[PDB]
Write a protein that binds this ligand. Structure first.
Ligand SMILES: CC(=O)N[C@@H]1[C@@H](O)[C@H](O[C@@H]2O[C@H](CO)[C@@H](O[C@@H]3O[C@H](CO[C@H]4O[C@H](CO)[C@@H](O)[C@H](O)[C@@H]4O[C@@H]4O[C@H](CO)[C@@H](O)[C@H](O)[C@H]4NC(C)=O)[C@@H](O)[C@H](O[C@H]4O[C@H](CO)[C@@H](O)[C@H](O)[C@@H]4O[C@@H]4O[C@H](CO)[C@@H](O)[C@H](O)[C@H]4NC(C)=O)[C@@H]3O)[C@H](O)[C@H]2NC(C)=O)[C@@H](CO)O[C@H]1NC(=O)C[C@H](N)C(=O)O
Ligand SMILES: CC(=O)N[C@@H]1[C@@H](O)[C@H](O[C@@H]2O[C@H](CO)[C@@H](O[C@@H]3O[C@H](CO[C@H]4O[C@H](CO)[C@@H](O)[C@H](O)[C@@H]4O[C@@H]4O[C@H](CO)[C@@H](O)[C@H](O)[C@H]4NC(C)=O)[C@@H](O)[C@H](O[C@H]4O[C@H](CO)[C@@H](O)[C@H](O)[C@@H]4O[C@@H]4O[C@H](CO)[C@@H](O)[C@H](O)[C@H]4NC(C)=O)[C@@H]3O)[C@H](O)[C@H]2NC(C)=O)[C@@H](CO)O[C@H]1NC(=O)C[C@H](N)C(=O)O
Ligand SMILES: Nc1nc2c(ncn2[C@@H]2O[C@H](COP(=O)(O)OP(=O)(O)O)[C@@H](O)[C@H]2O)c(=O)[nH]1
Lengths: 467, 453
């Protein structure tokens, strides 16, 4: 049986889109009869009117996802799936006889920062899960804390943290290492041979439930291992608890990560605070349609300690929540200390706890916070805006989309598409167009983002029925 | 549980709308820095890209309405509601004792065209249904046929078609006529007193189920009496079948009705919406031939349409050798059978066709485009809307609105703005159409529980 509110909202979304289309044709015809001041004046009003109209449509779509008991079901199903995966990971990590268990050894000391190192451990963990090997994490001489993983986080196992085994060797494939008890896994950047237990694929035994519950099952699958990893030590839980109080961290709140310093060189670009705040302002307007928002709170995480004073001045109607001492210690000089390790764990924690995350996905810091966020809600796939890259996991397999609508290129920078063409996406320009390659042609260029759908990849993982 | 396709479709509608907003902000910013011919070319290309993008969203929204067995449920529920009402109407129309039954007499000979006369009979029928009086239809001296109503349609009753009784009077109110057996009802144009059994209200006992199934319950309620009235005689049934074969009426097909003897609209004003909707249909089905059923009172229009749109196939009953009443009935039939209806709702004939169309699908309320008026029923009570989002007037022609304000709508300008009066402020002007919702009116009708036995 269909719900009454479900049908009212569906038809209102249809009529709102139709009316928006009536509005677009009428106003665009008027616009091309203008030039100079009048053209700029009316197009600005046109854009303002369109914004509210578009957000009313987005608000009805939000209500549609909650009506008819769908919100409670999606919450229950996401909770059941999380507990299913966590129990499997815990069973894998705690065999009865550690001296006889197949193992995978991971070294945390990758030459990069915390988020990059955390994603290395995640990649180790997912391959360990894929091969039914207990993850052994070797973290001594960790650049952030010489005492290792247990300085901040609980150990990845309770019964089996020892590397003992009758045979040991470097990774050389799941079939060749079939009878090697202890396999050491290197970093993903030069792994050969690559096993299938890599992003962005998900387990096929969970895929049907995931696509039904979650808008990007790839990130959800990655987040399950992030969730298991960052179980905090008791002293760290209390720091997080204390910081939440002293920071005045309450909802609604939008998280903003401004990555600079050594990233601006080659891995990303410099972005003014205005580029972040336009999306912060836009999302608070959306929230104000469904809830009361008296104070617009922004948790600002950044490695530029001069940004907080700048943001408070240029956006005085916002309440910025930030730890400027953490920002200062994030500088390349004082970056690899236990106090700085606490700082980045705290910054990522509050970013992940926000109701919306504005940042650059080229930074591993924001990707981690976006992954953790997936463990805090039934489906937080779209609660982000990245100023550059789409979501990715470094070392992932080819991220492919499928063309659903044909495209004939208007300029030379666009690529043709036929329905069914596999499209290897490179990025979303957030202007209606995405850049990628057509795997029937080899051509790279732009194409309308709405003319493709995400190709969900699946992999036959072990299901751990004993758990 | 939730449906996998339902969630996939909702999220794609969400992301499709989000990408549309990305596309709008980018191209409009570029559009401000243009002038002259380059502005015209980019604005025209902008509109073309927006069209296909908008239709992808609407297509996903159509699929959403169908998945998870929702299409089957809506068809079954719309069927149950129709059978329920038709069973009640049939019970009312066929009492056991005609000489003792309470009646309402309706004269079909209103001074207007066929479509307006049919609506007069509908308005009679709805009041008869409201007052539990058997409708007696008088069709002698009908300008369209000497033999009367039954030359085309079945009699409105099988057991009670005379006006016998103990007392007869003109309409004076349901309470005053409590003991008048046979009440004669005049046209609605000067009816006094007006009863509550009038559009656009729906029966309160059906309102909840109707809102769930149908996008415009008012026209659905009107269409039930249209459906009962136009039950065809066997020979009209065969003429319709013969006309269908000879014309090659097949689906998909869009109906176009062009009335021209009040205001003049050239054929291009109709065809732009015809072409737009065939582009929509082409996204969900194969469209080999773009067929258009053209109903017109203009002999030069059909040749104009064929000349200007040579890739279209135009169909009209002028192709039929054996065909005023027969012509308008066939026109109404084929227009109502179409997948989409482009016309002017100021025409009574198109309104009839739009109403019949509601009886052929679970929810066809939106399968139209009107060049002028929104749907109405002549003689209806005030059509009111409720403002849902505030509006600050941007020009002198716009009116303010606060959430909750009752808005008496005068029409939709099909440009994003509707025209009406804000009753809280006594001000009349323009307002964005998306900032209001329809105010569904209900009336306590009889429910005829004896019709279930
Ligand atoms: C040995 C070691 O220790 N290495 C350390 C690294 O591991 C650390 O991390 C790496 O940091 C890099 C830089 O941030 C990361 O690169 C980014 O990778 C993105 C992912 O690319 C994937 O997926 C894309 C789809 O999203 C796809 O298009 C790519 O082709 C790529 O996919 C391939 O696909 C193969 C199948 O086809 C598959 O087999 C491969 O496995 C897969 N590769 C990976 C890595 O998964 C990528 O999207 C980024 O690209 C953008 O940015 C650069 C500038 O940095 C631009 O040049 C690019 O054009 C691209 O621009 C983007 O383009 C979009 C389209 O227009 C646009 O919208 C975006 O805005 C724009 N982005 C901009 C402008 O910023 C980029 O290449 C890499 O993923 C990280 N790897 C891991 C494992 O985490 C690294 C951290 O700093 O540190 C290294 N350590 C050292 O160097 C140690 C040092 N030597 C020492 O001191 O000792
Ligand atoms: C005695 C006899 O037999 N008479 C015959 C008539 O009965 C036949 O039918 C009547 O035809 C009229 C002409 O087409 C119809 O009038 C139209 O009615 C429209 C509906 O008005 C409703 O609903 C509106 C909302 O949609 C609302 O705004 C209106 O105010 C009106 O509502 C009132 O509401 C009251 C409560 O407040 C309620 O008590 C009343 O009962 C109710 N009235 C009715 C009638 O229901 C109306 O929208 C039409 O108006 C548009 O068109 C006229 C031009 O005709 C314009 O001047 C208007 O401004 C308006 O324009 C529209 O404006 C919109 C806003 O900008 C815009 O979007 C539209 O595009 C635009 N449309 C245009 C320009 O076309 C119009 O008034 C009437 O409803 C019919 N009545 C019935 C019962 O069917 C008639 C036709 O066959 O024939 C008569 N017979 C003869 O003439 C023969 C003669 N006696 C002889 O020669 O012998
Ligand atoms: N506390 C804190 N630390 C940061 C911030 N931005 C960068 N850092 C530090 O700089 C390191 C950057 O390494 P990585 O995690 O790979 O992030 P990436 O360089 O942006 O890809 C982080 O691990 C942090 O130690 C920030 O906003 N807050």
């Amino acid at each position: 049986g269909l719900g009454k509110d479900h049908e009212i909202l569906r038809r209102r979304i249809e009529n709102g889109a139709k009316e928006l289309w009536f509005f677009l044709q009428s106003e665009l015809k008027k616009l091309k009869n203008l030039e100079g001041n009048e053209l700029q004046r009316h197009a600005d009003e046109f854009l303002l009117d369109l914004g509210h109209h578009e957000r009313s449509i987005m608000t009805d779509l939000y209500y549609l996802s909650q009506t008819d008991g769908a919100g409670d079901w999606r919450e229950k199903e996401a909770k059941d799936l999380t507990e299913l995966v966590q129990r499997r990971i815990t069973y894998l990590q705690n065999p009865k006889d550690c001296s006889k268990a197949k193992k995978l050894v991971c070294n945390i000391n990758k030459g990069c920062g915390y988020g990059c190192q955390l994603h290395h451990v995640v990649y180790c963990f997912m391959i360990a899960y894929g091969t039914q090997r207990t993850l052994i994490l070797e973290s001594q001489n960790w650049r952030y804390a010489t005492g290792g993983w247990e300085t901040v986080f609980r150990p990845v196992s309770e019964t089996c943290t020892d590397r003992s085994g009758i045979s040991t060797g470097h990774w050389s494939g799941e079939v060749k290492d079939k009878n090697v008890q202890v396999v050491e896994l290197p970093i993903v950047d030069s792994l050969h041979p690559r096993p299938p237990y890599l992003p962005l694929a998900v387990p096929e035994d969970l895929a049907d439930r995931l696509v039904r519950v979650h808008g990007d099952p790839a990130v959800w699958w990655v987040s399950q291992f992030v969730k298991y990893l960052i179980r905090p030590q008791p002293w760290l839980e209390k720091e997080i608890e204390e910081a939440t109080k002293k920071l005045g961290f309450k909802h609604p709140v939008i998280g903003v990560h401004v990555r600079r310093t050594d990233k601006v060189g080659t891995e990303a670009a410099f972005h003014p605070i205005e580029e972040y705040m336009v999306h912060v302002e836009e999302h608070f307007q959306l929230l104000a349609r469904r809830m009361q928002v008296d104070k617009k709170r922004v948790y600002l995480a950044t490695d530029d300690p001069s940004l907080l004073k700048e943001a408070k001045t240029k956006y005085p109607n916002y309440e910025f929540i930030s730890d400027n001492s953490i920002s200062w210690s994030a500088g390349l000089h004082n970056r690899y200390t236990e106090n700085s390790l606490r700082g980045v764990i705290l910054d990522i924690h509050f970013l992940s706890q926000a109701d919306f995350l504005v940042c650059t996905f080229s930074s591993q810091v924001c990707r981690v916070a976006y992954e953790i966020m997936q463990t805090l809600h039934p489906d937080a796939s779209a609660n982000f805006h990245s100023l550059d890259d789409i979501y990715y996991f470094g070392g992932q397999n080819a991220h492919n989309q499928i063309a659903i609508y044909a495209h004939q290129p208007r300029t030379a920078d666009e690529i043709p598409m036929e329905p069914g063409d596999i499209i290897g996406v490179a990025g979303n320009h957030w202007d209606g167009y995405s850049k990628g390659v057509n795997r029937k042609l080899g051509r790279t260029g732009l194409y309308p983002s709405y003319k493709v759908r995400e190709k969900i990849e699946t992999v036959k993982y072990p299901t751990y029925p004993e758990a």
